[PDB]
Amino acid sequence: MKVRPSVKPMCEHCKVIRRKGRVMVICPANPKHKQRQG
Amino acid sequence: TKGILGKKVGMTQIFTESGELIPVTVVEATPNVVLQVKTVETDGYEAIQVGYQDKREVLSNKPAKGHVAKANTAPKRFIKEFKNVELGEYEVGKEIKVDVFQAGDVVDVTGTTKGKGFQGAIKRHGQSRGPMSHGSRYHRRPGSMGPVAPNRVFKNKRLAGRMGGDRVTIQNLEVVKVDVERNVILIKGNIPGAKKSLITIKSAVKA
Amino acid sequence: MRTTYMAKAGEVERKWYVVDATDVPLGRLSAVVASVLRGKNKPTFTPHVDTGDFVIVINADKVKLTGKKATDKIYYRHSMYPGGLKSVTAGELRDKNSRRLIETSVKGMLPKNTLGRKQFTKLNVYGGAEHPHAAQQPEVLDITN
Amino acid sequence: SRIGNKVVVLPAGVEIKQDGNNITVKGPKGELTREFSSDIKMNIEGNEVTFTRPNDSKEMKTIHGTTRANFNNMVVGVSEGFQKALELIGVGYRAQVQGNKLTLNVGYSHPVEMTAPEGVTFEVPANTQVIVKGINKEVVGELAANIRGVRPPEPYKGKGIRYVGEFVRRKEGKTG
């Protein structure tokens, strides 16, 4: 995980998804991309 | 479950079968009549009243001799209860000899501590004195009472007040002998109480 | 001095009512109840005589909490010792000790003196579905309030 | 809802009733009972079914999808049932079963077991494959998860448990 205030997709495959009162970023290709806004 | 009261005689030693001295105290006992059976449908729980010693007759009153005589005994001195015991299995006026603790080997004695009167704030908490020389004048006192901001004294600041006289239990002690012909148990270790006090022994709680 | 009706002690007659709590938010049920208890709705109101009624609350488990407050309205207490702040409960008391709920959410909305205490022991709250007080023939209230 | 507007083509041997919200589905093996939202207009016509519903769902489009997907799940489950196949690498790993026990030897000191509820069984071909079969999709999935949860793979040599078609990246870490 990378937990940052600002969150951006870094690959082309990355997607922006809300799961709870939070904002994920999931990328099946690489794992270094899981970003969760906090 | 397995519960017995009794006196407290003292302490001596005993060799085991392998040449090893063992400190041992002498919990004495006598037979003792179950006095009343408290049930769910009547008293909200399940328990058993017992009593370990014999009064004279001058030293009781009609309530006591009317509350005992439903089991036909001389009026007793102590009366206690027990819980978590498999009730069943019992009757009004039975007995509980020392048999129940053959080599139970795990047991939790309780009792009442000694008594030590008004005591300082060092014999009760292990608080340390202040420098007894180098010109000081703070030998044997209880320290400060806290900070300034709150304009009061917090709860649970500890200082002088009667020491000892409240019950306490020890856990996981063994048993060494059961001399049914004289009703005496022998356990390992130190047990609390003054001589001739009242003691109770039940099976372990921590399995 | 002139003529205005001032209720005496015993001339006031109290009644008995039974109120349900099936799917009602905590606040409003408590509000109606608290208004009934203090003696209002009786034109014989007097602000130092205890002209109240007797309330009996049923089904205190099925009371409704809107939105969250199922897991957020955190009650509290303090034991007057250092670090004693025990926030133990939540909106879980609906399950257990459901009497505690209304017996605070109303023992708040009353005054804070003796009158406001002897005016509280007329409460009887039951999480269950039937009361033992048929000895006194209580009636029913409705709620479009 | 393009997912809440497909067909429910019942197979052979299918009984479907309605008692309250409870729409049970029975057939050759299935006797399942689920719940369904109170805004669902079921259909008719032996084996040709759809789901008309009074729309304006949560956001005009939500409940439809889950509801029709779940009913199609019911149907497919009662008809045949499902599978989840597992492999095993990590030289020295085996698995043996006698009914509702699955011992596992995957390198720990002591062999790990696994119980089983009723609606599921295990069909062990050899020491390197397992196959779960059952009725529900959820339960099959959960048990397969719990089983993989004992030792998921490792991206260096390839040990651990995998699904069959599951992919695992390999970080070619040097040897010292």
Binding site: - | - | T3, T4, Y5, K40, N41, K42, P43, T44, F45 | -
Partner: protein, 59 residues
Amino acid sequence: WIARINAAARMNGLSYSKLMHGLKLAEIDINRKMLADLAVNDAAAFTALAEQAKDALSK
């Protein structure tokens, strides 16, 4: 007196506003003190007034 008019009146389906409003509309001008006294004692008369007021703002 206001709280007492509240209690009594509300029983007749007249909120403690609409009663006063209708009364000051049908041109009836009783003083609150007398209204409180009536509400406590002469229930028949109070109900008569409440009826007239109900009629009044009904127009």
